[PDB]
Amino acid sequence: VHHQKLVFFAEDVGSNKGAIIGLMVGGVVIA
Amino acid sequence: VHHQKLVFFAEDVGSNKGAIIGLMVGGVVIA
Amino acid sequence: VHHQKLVFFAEDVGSNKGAIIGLMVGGVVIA
Amino acid sequence: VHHQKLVFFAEDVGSNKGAIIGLMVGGVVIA
Amino acid sequence: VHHQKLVFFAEDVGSNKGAIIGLMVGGVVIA
Amino acid sequence: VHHQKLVFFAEDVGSNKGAIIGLMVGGVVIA
Amino acid sequence: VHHQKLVFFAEDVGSNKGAIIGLMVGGVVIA
Amino acid sequence: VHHQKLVFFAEDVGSNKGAIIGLMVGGVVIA
Amino acid sequence: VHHQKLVFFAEDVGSNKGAIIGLMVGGVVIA
Amino acid sequence: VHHQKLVFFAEDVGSNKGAIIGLMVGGVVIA
């Protein structure tokens, strides 16, 4: 197992008001 | 197991008002 | 197990008003 | 287990008004 | 277990008005 | 003409990440 | 013309991360 | 014309990280 | 024209990290 | 024209880390 760059943003992100998660094992994510 | 660069931002981020998490084991994330 | 660069910002970040977390084991994150 | 550079900022950060955490074991983070 | 450079700032930080924490074991962080 | 309580919140508001406007005369509101 | 209590919050507000405006005459509001 | 209490908070506000404006004549508000 | 109590806080404010403005004539407010 | 109590805090303010402005004529406010 070899995880790498799970979430990738090649260009700029204007703003973040939610949740950006690379890897989760649990749950209960509310956006 | 070898985790690396789980969340990647190649360019600038304007602002962050939520949650940026690379790896989580629990839960209950509210955005 | 070998964690490295879980959250990566290649360019500048304008501002942070939320939560930037590399790794968590618990939960209850409110953004 | 070998943690390293959990949160990385390659360029300048304009300002921080939230929480920047490398690793947490508990919870109850309010942003 | 070998922790190192949990939070890394490669370039200058304009200002800090929140919380920058390398490692925590408890909780109740309010930003 | 008598404007009063254009937007009313009788109970608590968990959070606001958009725009709450009582009265507008122009336009171009982006949510 | 008599404006009064254009935006009303009868109970507590947990947090504000957007824009709360009572009255506007222009525009270009980005949330 | 008689403006009064354009934005009203009857109870406590936990925190403010956006913009609270009573009256504006221009524009270009970014939240 | 008679402006009064444009922004009102009847109870305590936990903290302010954005902008609280009673009246503006220009623009370019960034939160 | 008669301005009075443009921004009102009836109870205690825990802390201020942004900008509290009663009246502005220009612009370019960054929070």
Numbering used by the authors:
A (entry chain B), B (entry chain D), C (entry chain F), D (entry chain H), E (entry chain J), F (entry chain A), ...: 12 to 42
Quoted from the paper:
Alzheimer’s disease is the most common form of dementia and is neuropathologically defined by the presence of extracellular plaques containing Aβ in the brain parenchyma and intraneuronal neurofibrillary tangles containing phosphorylated tau. These Aβ monomers tend to aggregate into insoluble fibrils, the structure of which has been extensively studied in vitro by cryogenic-electron microscopy (cryo-EM) and solid-state nuclear magnetic resonance spectroscopy, revealing a spectrum of different polymorphs. Two human fibril polymorphs have been determined: ‘type I filaments’, which are mostly associated with sporadic Alzheimer’s disease (SAD), and ‘type II filaments’, which are observed in familial Alzheimer’s disease (FAD) and other neurodegenerative disorders with amyloid brain pathology.
Each monomeric subunit is stabilized by two hydrophobic clusters around residues L17, V18, F20, V24, N27, I31 and L34, and residues A30, I32, M35, V40 and A42. The interface between the two protofilaments is rather small, involving only two symmetric hydrogen bonds between K28 and A42 of the opposing subunit. Strong, localized densities can be observed close to K16 in murine type III, DI1, DI2, DI3 and murine type II Aβ fibrils. However, given our new knowledge of structural differences in Aβ fibrils, the preclinical testing of this treatment might have been more predictive for efficacy in FAD. Furthermore, [11C]PiB also works effectively in the ARTE10, tg-APPSwe and APP23 mouse models, which all show an Aβ fibril fold similar to human type II filaments as long as the mice exhibit high total brain Aβ levels.
